[PDB]
Amino acid sequence: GSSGSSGNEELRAQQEAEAAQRLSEEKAQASAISVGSRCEVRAPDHSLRRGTVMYVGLTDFKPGYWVGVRYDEPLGKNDGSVNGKRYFECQAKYGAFVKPSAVTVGDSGPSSG
């Protein structure tokens, strides 16, 4: 009786004071960037790139917050699906995974659209 799927009740407390006070800077940036808007990104890969926000939030392969951005040319690293977990829809070397602090919104919206 009583099937199983997803539990974790203690985590609810760990992600309240520990994953809130220390991750207040990353959260403020993660809870600001909109989805589906052209934004720039900075990294040691090569140079500045231009893509659109696809996913914004926590991850499975890495902790903290993350932001998915797709580019027109082959300037990505991941392929959307990392370690089985999928975020966006696109081929490889197109949708790179950076952080809010690493992201830069250039054209999100005046209010909503």
UniProtKB/Swiss-Prot annotation:
Disulfide bonds: none annotated. It is found in: Cytoplasm; Cytoplasm, Cytoskeleton. Signal peptide: none annotated. Phosphorylation by PAK1 is required for normal function. Residues 57-99 form the CAP-Gly domain. Disruption phenotype: Mice display significantly longer axons than wild-type mice. Overexpression of Tbcb causes microtubule depolymerization, growth cone retraction and axonal damage followed by neuronal degeneration. Widely expressed with highest levels in brain. Broadly distributed throughout the neonate brain but restricted mainly to ependymary cells in the adult brain where it is concentrated in the cilia. It comes from the Eukaryota. The modification N6-acetyllysine is found at K93. Binds to alpha-tubulin folding intermediates after their interaction with cytosolic chaperonin in the pathway leading from newly synthesized tubulin to properly folded heterodimer. Involved in regulation of tubulin heterodimer dissociation. May function as a negative regulator of axonal growth. Supercomplex made of cofactors A to E. Cofactors A and D function by capturing and stabilizing tubulin in a quasi-native conformation. Cofactor E binds to the cofactor D-tubulin complex; interaction with cofactor C then causes the release of tubulin polypeptides that are committed to the native state. Cofactors B and E can form a heterodimer which binds to alpha-tubulin and enhances their ability to dissociate tubulin heterodimers. Interacts with GAN. Interacts with DCTN1. Belongs to the TBCB family. This is Tubulin-folding cofactor B. It comes from Mus musculus.
